[PDB]
Amino acid sequence: VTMSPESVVAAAGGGNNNSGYNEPQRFALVVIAVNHNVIRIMNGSMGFPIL
């Protein structure tokens, strides 16, 4: 990921009143993945054949 000049200037301070970036800013990258799975029901109890 390549960031933006607005982000790099918001990370530094120097903002005036009611500007949002009046204080140094910290950022956290988060990634999530939605995937498939298989659930087998047998003999009344559940289990994961592939886990």
Binding site: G44, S45, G47, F48, P49, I50, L51
Partner: peptide
Amino acid sequence: LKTFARTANSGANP
């Protein structure tokens, strides 16, 4: 490595 999970014994309901 390939692994699978077995419930085997149940909890407390049935």
